[model samples]
Target: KGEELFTGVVPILVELDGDVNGHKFSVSGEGEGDATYGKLTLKFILTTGKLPVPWPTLVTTLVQCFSRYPDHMKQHDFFKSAMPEGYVQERTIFFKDDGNYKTRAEVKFEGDTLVNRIELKGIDFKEDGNILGHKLEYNYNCHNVYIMADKQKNGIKVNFKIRHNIEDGSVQLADHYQQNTPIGDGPVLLPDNHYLSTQSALSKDPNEKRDHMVLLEFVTAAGI
Candidate 1:
């Protein structure tokens, strides 16, 4: 049972963030499991000095733009076609930080299966001033996303999509997530069950399964 330190009823937290956000924000999903299945819910709050934008025309324009990104759109279709069961995004609140906004996106999952509910708000860019201001706003409900285990990948890849929210004038990240399998990464369970310890060890650990798990999990924010 020595592996108990690394296995059994383990609580896993995967950090879904990259150097893009200045390494400023990361997602941590907690799951308690023995082997078959475990319940997981991730929480991440980020702050920026950007301003809010109008969400009206922004969404309409976004749909038009996304149509051009065939590859990205295809990846999203693959993710959704695979994962079926889903949950909802309660709400998201963005606070003012510096001169930008601090956005808090929280989601819940009751599946008790192999998936979890996750919601992500659009990254508050310089254009979006603040919540009170007429910057950018999105349909948190529409952007609601979910994550689940991948049959091919060694780890769980997020399932979601995005376009725009014409209702608002800001550029929003509708569909909290989508499949974004990067490359070169390992899987090492870490402390606090917050992040995969393998993330730090990916560079050294030549394990294929571990590396694939990490690489296949991280995604970009703006779909860029």
Candidate 2:
């Protein structure tokens, strides 16, 4: 809508540095790609700082050690999973020296689909509107995650997951999203055209949905 903020191919650097049982290794590489082209590849060059370890055995040991940490390897998959599709933006609101309480809200929308996240500070709400008395505070920060896909007749169905709902300064969210229907404290359904508006309203309004719910909407684009 606005000016093309920035565009063109860019260079990405991937570096790994660690010490396993006093054997230090540092590897650096570069990945070259653009917004919509090229298979980004990395070529690593290793340096052992000053340790006189044999390079061949050190490299072999590192490969073996990588297998020991499945969680570490899974991180790369998650990084690729988070790559933006078309656009990305981040917005934050900071409270001035107001009277009641200082608060802030932050939102980030990556691409048009996956990485939809929201963070709220010092907000108040409950699981369901039916819960009359007890209102849970959002404490200092709350993180909401959404993964969406298009379903026929049902339109776009978004699975809203609460990654973190810090209540009373600690994570207190439990079963915030249910898989079944007549959702309680779960994803909201919106008209297909309401994607941009609804995502924007989430950061500004706490009661946007019945139960402080987060929703995502999308249309199936070609071959996506």
Candidate 3:
């Protein structure tokens, strides 16, 4: 019931409130990207009323779990050989020494739910270059995040558990978790906990506020 074909960057907006795997969280944001180009940024806010264990302990546990990225990836069919023949992509699983930390998360089938996890020793940020030119150094005191999204009767439920350690101390050692539920015709906010269904992001009107802003970026390892 809208208009005809359009070109250029078309902004999208959305908003939602529900539960991911029984955990509750809210999502909202807008996007100016597409499947073939551009990027989508979504903001999410989550809260865990009470903790069964200390936050620092959870962070430490996640750090250890995510450190074994290679081992974990081997268990699932999510990662492909990104390195060219004879190219050794040697780097810490997840950590930043003195710059912005960057890496990749691959996800696939886990029955009805999709899951992805990452661990980092340390992550840091530095004031240099534009947003396009920046790198993060991975070091010790890492962190980990586990994303689990389950299919619901009406929408997809997304869950996020994150723990990390940084040098700046800006991010206190703690455990973070968030869950998202999709409403309306938009795709599940965490379709696979890795990608925002382009169809959903582009299926909104300009100036509309979405429940979450899904930001997608392309990144490479330091070796590259």
Candidate 4:
């Protein structure tokens, strides 16, 4: 066969920044992924420029806030829709992009498999064929969130949660990640054979109009 299989370790680099109580914060780091089993160990550093505490303590707080469970995804019904690409966009909240109507996507790939975008330390999608030529998909990529703990400090309360699709299935996502799965200081062990793609919602209260931004850089290397 001309095709090949990746049964080795895949290196991961994540970078993202989003709003937290009208303030700004970002997290980025490297993760060691077992592509064969879909499990990963990520060592990310949280940078809170506007939070009440220093970035160093925020790291400690994040390490302690991590949940003891793993995260999962479900895309059997989420993808491969009978409807057109744009039509499918109207059906759900996963991988929905409004940019197909404009310029070309910064990131491009053949299959519906997962692929993060261009630039680093920062951020920037489309669809093709029956796949709808990847668009710049971003907003509300999340489906559900399971909260772990909520600890308040004066007007702000720290929180943590895990994100996943609606029904729970394999991990075959082309940027259709869970949205604002916001609020988490932890991670979980998920099973996937290609990439270590999971989102943890770590924030400081959403009711106050605050949000957390994240960027995941998924890199891979064949058998070590």
Q: Which candidate number would show the highest lDDT if scored against the true structure?
A: 1
| Higher-ranked by TM-score: 1 or 2 | 1
Model 2 residue 84 CA deviation (Å) reads 12
Question: For candidate 1, lDDT tens digit of each residue in 1-224?
Answer: 11222123333333332121232333333334332111122222222332224322122111000011123323332222222222121223232241222222111222322333233334444433333254433332223234344546533344333433333454444332323221223331111101111000011224432211111111211232
How well is each residue in 1-224 modelled by candidate 2, as lDDT tens digits? Answer: 10011134344443334343343545443333232221222233443353222221111111000011122222211112223321112222111221011112111122321222212121122223211122234221222333233434222232322222223443333222211111122232322211111111111134333222121112111111
* Candidate 3 similarity to native, TM-score: 0.25
Q: Which stretches of candidate 3 lie over 4 Å from their true place?
A: 1-8, 12-31, 41-149, 162-176, 185-224
- Clashes per model (N, Cα, C within 3 A): 27, 0, 28, 35
Indicate which candidate wins on TM-score.
Answer: 4
Residue lDDT tens for model 4, 1-224: 00111234444444434332234566554444443443445555554454322222122112111111222321111111111110001101122321111111111112422221212111111223211221212222322222221122111111222221222232223222111111222331221222222333332323434323332222221111
Against the unseen true structure, what C-alpha lDDT does each candidate score? Answer: 0.27, 0.24, 0.25, 0.25
TM accuracy, model 1: 0.24
Worst 10 residues of 1 by lDDT: 193-202
**Where is model 2 more than 4 Å wrong at Cα?**
1-7, 49-224
lDDT of 2: 0.24
The TM-score ranking, best first, is: 4, 3, 1, 2
Candidate 3 C-alpha RMSD relative to the actual structure: 16.8
lDDT score for residue 51 of model 2: 29
Better of 3 and 4 by TM-score: 4
